[PDB]
Amino acid sequence: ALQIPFAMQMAYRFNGIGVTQNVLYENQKLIANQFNSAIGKIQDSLSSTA
Amino acid sequence: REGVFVSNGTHWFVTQRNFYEPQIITTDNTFVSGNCDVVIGIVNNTVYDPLQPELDS
Ligand SMILES: *[C@@H]1O[C@H](CO)[C@@H](O[C@@H]2O[C@H](CO)[C@@H](O)[C@H](O)[C@H]2NC(C)=O)[C@H](O)[C@H]1NC(C)=O
Ligand SMILES: *[C@@H]1O[C@H](CO)[C@@H](O[C@@H]2O[C@H](CO)[C@@H](O)[C@H](O)[C@H]2NC(C)=O)[C@H](O)[C@H]1NC(C)=O
Ligand SMILES: *[C@@H]1O[C@H](CO)[C@@H](O)[C@H](O)[C@H]1NC(C)=O
């Protein structure tokens, strides 16, 4: 397990799908907020959809 | 363009992600997008321009 800053990990994840990493870095706050909102939506779905 | 930036404590280098092989940071290793006020964690260094010494001499 080789430690790496999470933002750089996401930069690799973005490069792996054909999106240049500067898109991640310039939009890091937006991406983090979208991730957190998606997780909250997962929580609401699991808490409400039997 | 490929790899990551690394520092040995005094100098910054760029090397491939899966094998340590430090190279001098140049315009042929990196690309420019945006400016210093956007990227979180951006650091100050210098980027060598291989063209400069050819036109200076
Ligand atoms: C980090 O890397 C730089 C680049 O190689 C090192 O600087 C060189 O150090 C050697 C001695 O180990 C000198 O002979 C060279 O002249 C130095 N070159 C430059 C451009 O400074 C630096 O010593 C390295 N730092 C550590 C802690 O290993
Ligand atoms: C990296 O370098 C830039 C300049 O190249 C630094 O920007 C300076 O920031 C101070 C603090 O607000 C200002 O007073 C200076 O006027 C800025 N410089 C310029 C040219 O406008 C930046 O702070 C540096 N960052 C680090 C971490 O060293
Ligand atoms: C990394 O986190 C430390 C706090 O643990 C902070 O002081 C430092 O400025 C941060 N550096 C970057 C590049 O985010």
Query: Burial of A20 by CB count in 10 Å (0-12 exposed, 13-18 middle, 19+ buried)?
Result: middle
List of residues 6+ apart from B42 with CB closer than 8 A:
B36
Please judge whether B33 and A22 are an interchain contact, meaning their C-beta atoms are less than 8 angstroms apart: yes
The experimental method is cryo-EM
Please judge whether B38 and A5 are an interchain contact, meaning their C-beta atoms are less than 8 angstroms apart: no
- Pick the closest to residue A19 from A1, A2, A31, A4 (CA basis): A31
Pocket test for ligand 1, best of B5, B7, B8 (most atoms within 8 A of CB): B8
